[PDB]
Structure 1
């Protein structure tokens, strides 16, 4: 509260570390469905159904331009990518499997780097 603060957690490396994680996600072999924004002209249903599209290139641009205020807003956008993928894709599809694999991969790196 006013004039009463928990001890300062060092966040000075968060930007670099989120960039490293994102690089690892970009280079994963199962990243291909997620590298670029879904083409809203060419994929029926996407525009109406997925209210907040997100992809790794869009996260990279936000990261590089100071549009994440803290490491939690970064994780929210990464998870949005996978939540969108589960909304639109069957679990038993190449893309559906890719999204589960990538979510697992991300959540481990996240825990190991920050928790």
Structure 2
């Protein structure tokens, strides 16, 4: 609270570490359904069903233009990608399973990197 300072973790490396993690996401072989925004003109249902679309290229742009205040807002957008995927796709589908694989892949890197 006011004039009661709390110990803060060092966040000076966060931008660089998130960029590194995002690069590893982008180059994963199962990253293909998530590299670009879903085409709202070709994909039936998506625009009405998915209230907040998100993809790796949009995250990359936001990260490169200072639109993430902190690393937690970065993680929210990444998880948003796989939450949207689960909403729209069957688990038994190629995109559905790709989503599950990428989520697991992200979370281990998140823990290994920041859960010091």
Same fold (TM over 0.5): yes
Q: Per the shorter chain, which TM-score range?
A: over 0.9
Give 3-state SS (helix, strand or coil) of 2:19's partner: helix
Is 1:72–2:63 an aligned residue pair? no
Match of 2:60 in 1: 60
Match of 1:4 in 2: 4
**Residues paired across the two proteins, number:** 115
Q: Which runs of at least 4 in structure 1 moved beyond 3 Å after TM superposition?
A: none
How many angstroms apart in 1 are the aligned matches of 2:87 and 2:110? 23
Which consecutive residues of structure 1, in runs of 5 or more, have no partner in the other structure?
A: none
Q: Deviations over 1:55-113 (max 9, x none)?
A: 00000000000000000000000000000000000000000000000000000000000
TM-score (norm 1): 0.99
How many angstroms apart in 1 are the aligned matches of 2:22 and 2:7? 28
Q: Deviations over 1:18-51 (max 9, x none)?
A: 0000000000000000000000000000000000
How many angstroms apart in 2 are the aligned matches of 1:38 and 1:8? 38
Give 3-state SS (helix, strand or coil) of 2:69's partner: coil
Which consecutive residues of structure 2, in runs of 5 or more, have no partner in the other structure?
A: none
Give 3-state SS (helix, strand or coil) of 1:5's partner: coil
